A = this chain, B = another copy of it.
Amino acid sequence: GMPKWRKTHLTYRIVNYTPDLPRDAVDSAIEKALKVWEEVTPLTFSRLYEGEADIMISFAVKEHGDNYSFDGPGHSLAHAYPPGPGLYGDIHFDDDEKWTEDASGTNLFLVAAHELGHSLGLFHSANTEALMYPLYNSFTELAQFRLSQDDVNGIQSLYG
C-alpha cells in the first residue's frame, strides 16, 4: 500500500506486446521512458523476462482482469498503480489506442514516461507543461524532450 518504493533498485518486465509497432520499437520506446526518470534520481532499473518484476508492463483491451476496464478508442489511454507489492507498480496500456513512434497516433514513449511516474509514486501535476499533467499533449517536439521542472521537483521530493 506504498507512496514510494523502499528499494531504489527496481525490476521491470514487458509482459506482452502490441502489434501496433515492432517489439524493438516498443523496447526503445519504454527504455527511453525509464531513462527520463532514471536520470533525475538514484533509482536503477533491471529487466526480467519471466516472473514478477516490481513494475509489470502490458497491453490490454476493454476488460483485463484488474478492476478498472479500458474503454475502446479514446477515453483513458493508460493506467498504472503506485508503489507496492503485487499489482501495485504495474502499467497497463489500452491497445484500442493506435500506439506509434511519433505523434501520428498516441505516442508510446510519452504515455510510458508519465505512467512510470504513477508507478514511482507520482500523482497528477497542476502545471500545464509537466509530464505528469493529466492531459495528453501531442504538440511537441520529441527528439527534443526534457522533463519539466515540476517533475524533477515532484520526483526528487520522493527520492531526493
Give chain A's interface residues, CB within 8 Å of chain B.
Answer: 63, 67-69, 71-76, 96, 102-106, 124, 128, 134-137
Contacts and interface: CB of A to CB of B under 8 A. Distances in A.
A71 B69 contact: no
Contacts of A103: 67-69
Contacts of A96: 74
B72 A74 contact: yes
A67 B104 contact: yes
A124 B76 CA distance: 17
Contacts of A137: 68, 71, 75-76
Given A72-B73, A74-B71, A96-B74, A105 B63 contact: yes
